[PDB]
Amino acid sequence: IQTTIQKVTVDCKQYVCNGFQKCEQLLREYGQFCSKINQALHGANLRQDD
């Protein structure tokens, strides 16, 4: 009956920027998107636990 799907959380600013300060600055220009991505994944995992 399938029942459940794998729970995965993706790090934000570590996937998109390999780890260079210049890239991180250009991203904090956009920094709301990473927050929404993390929020969505955390919510999905909480619901899966429930």
Binding site: T4, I5, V8, V16, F20, K22, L26, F33, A44
Partner: protein, 99 residues
């Protein structure tokens, strides 16, 4: 996989810092676009899994608990017993069907 997508457009070795910002902006935009895509797909799969979780709950309380005594396909033929085991991120059912 960006106009130039060389793992960092100008990782630290190419034209100039001013051009670097443009290429890295292009690469960031989409790296974020396919991350948003991943999140959307995860949401769709989670909701389908939740509907089927409810279905498995109904199955545990129907076919497994009391004898199904139900016309429903459950078991192929008259249903008698059914057992459950865990399966990778899922519930596996083994109905017994009379033929």
């Amino acid at each position: 996989t960006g106009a130039i997508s060389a793992s960092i457009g100008d990782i630290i070795q190419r034209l100039d810092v001013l051009e670097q910002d443009a290429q890295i902006d292009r690469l960031i935009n989409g790296r974020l676009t396919t991350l948003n895509a991943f999140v959307a797909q995860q949401l769709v799969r989670s909701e389908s899994a939740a509907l089927s979780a409810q279905l498995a709950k109904d199955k545990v309380n129907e076919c497994v608990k009391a004898q199904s005594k139900r016309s429903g396909f459950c078991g192929q033929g008259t249903h008698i017993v059914s057992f459950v085991v865990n399966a990778p991120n899922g519930l596996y059912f083994m109905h017994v069907g009379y033929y």
